[PDB]
Amino acid sequence: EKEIRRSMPLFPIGPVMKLTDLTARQIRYYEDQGLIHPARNQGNHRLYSLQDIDVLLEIKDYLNDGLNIAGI
Amino acid sequence: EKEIRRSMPLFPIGPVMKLTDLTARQIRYYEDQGLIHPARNQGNHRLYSLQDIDVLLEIKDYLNDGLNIAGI
DNA sequence: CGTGTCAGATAATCTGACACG
DNA sequence: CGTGTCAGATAATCTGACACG
């Protein structure tokens, strides 16, 4: 009942910039890097999931201390 | 721990049109009618809350059967 | 008395290439 | 090898007035 409401693509890239402190440039750099694949809009926007937002914070925490992308 | 994550204004009027079947014209008609007050963006957009989305469905159910606005 | 649709704005997001300590 | 910022597009949202069975 949890892996359905969260994994549903609901937010655009704006609100997720508010939750995190990540810049659209950071959040979209991780897309063409091979570790996050959020849904697309009818207008080719990016829908992020509630658990995908947690995944963008999984990276946020693995980057305030420091780490590359090939490692994660 | 529930009346904080929900009541936080997070969605714009687009995603809430997806959850409901309500048109932006309906969702914004209820604003200038005196029964819903969602937050504004820096760009003067409308942030809806997760419990505000429930309130827009409270109206959705009180309108498939039929009812005015002065009553609710 | 509730909602579709228009037309002209403004904010938000797209991809592409360039910049740099 | 990760991110700011640019410039020109397109989708998304604003307010205002008009339409109608």
Per-residue burial over B8-47, b = 16 or more CB atoms within 10 Å of its CB, e = otherwise:
ebbbbbebbeebeebeeeebeebeeeeebebeeeeeeebb
Burial of B49 per CB tally in 10 Å (0-12, 13-18, 19+): buried
Give resolution in angstroms: 3.5
**Collapsed DSSP state (helix, strand, coil) of residue A8:** coil
**DSSP label at residue A65:** S
Using CA atoms, how far residue B5 sits from A18, A30, B10, B12, in Å, is: 14, 26, 9, 16
Using CA atoms, how far residue A72 sits from A4, A26, A32, in Å, is: 25, 15, 14
Q: Which tokens hold the place of A58? A: 């999984």
Interface test with B, best of A2, A11, A20 (most B CBs within 10 A): A11
| B59 strand D contact, CB < 7 Å | no
Q: Please list, in sequence order, all residues whose beta carbon lies within 8 angstroms of the beta carbon of residue B47, skipping any fewer than 6 positions away.
A: A15, B9, B10, B11, B12, B38, B39, B40, B41
Using CA atoms, how far residue B35 sits from A43, B47, B67, in Å, is: 31, 15, 15
Rounded to whole angstroms, the Cα distance separating B28 from B12 reads 12
Q: Total structural domains in chain B?
A: 1
Q: Would an 8 Å CB–CB cutoff place B48 in contact with chain A?
A: no
Answer yes or no: are the C-beta atoms of A48 and A16 closer than 8 Å.
yes
Strand-strand pairing, B39-40 and A46-47: unpaired
- Residues in A closer than 8 angstroms to B19, CB to CB, are 10
* φ, ψ for residue A39, nearest 5 deg: -75, 165
List the domain range (segments joined by +) for residue B52: 1-72
| B42 strand D contact, CB < 7 Å | no
Residue type, B58: E
- Residues in B closer than 8 angstroms to A54, CB to CB, are none
Residue type, B19: L
Q: Which tokens hold the place of A44? A: 């080719």
